[PDB]
Amino acid sequence: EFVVEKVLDRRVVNGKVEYFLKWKGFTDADNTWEPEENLDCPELIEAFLNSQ
Amino acid sequence: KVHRARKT
């Protein structure tokens, strides 16, 4: 596990929710798409988006 | 807080 600096985007890949992460102290070239279950709290992203 | 996640 690595510290997440920011969540940049969200996509659904055959039912499966993934998010585009910037990792803290790594450049954008290192950004990755991660399945939701790789995050400690994906609910915070969902709650943020579903409230608009 | 500070969050962490598994990287692929």
Numbering used by the authors:
A (entry chain A): 29 to 80
B (entry chain B): 159 to 166
Article excerpt on this structure:
HP1 proteins function as structural adapters which assemble a variety of macromolecular complexes via either N-terminal chromodomain or C-terminal chromo shadow domain. In mammals, chromodomain-containing proteins are responsible for gene regulation related to chromatin remodeling and formation of heterochromatin. It has been reported that HP1 proteins mediate gene silencing by dynamic association of the chromodomain with methylated histone tails. Besides methylated histone H3K9, Cbx3, also known as HP1γ, can also bind to methylated Lys26 of histone H1 and methylated Lys185 of G9a.
On the other hand, Cbx3 chromodomain can bind to G9aK185 peptides with comparable binding affinity regardless of their methylation states. Six amino acid residues of both peptides, “KKAR(K26me2)S” of histone H1 and “HRAR(K185me3)T” of G9a (referred to as binding motif), are buried in the binding groove of Cbx3. In this region of both peptides, the carbonyl groups of H1K22 and G9aH181 form hydrogen bonds with Val32 of Cbx3, respectively. The root-mean-square deviations (RMSD) are 0.7 Å and 1.8 Å for the aligned Cα atoms of the complex structures of Cbx3-H1K26me2 and Cbx3-G9aK185me3 relative to Cbx3-H3K9me3, respectively. Because there are four Cbx3-G9aK185me3 complex in one asymmetric unit and the α helices from the four protomers assemble into a four-helix bundle. Consistent with previous reports, our research provided structural evidence that Cbx3 chromodomain interacts with automethylated K185 of G9a in a similar molecule mechanism compared with H3K9me3.
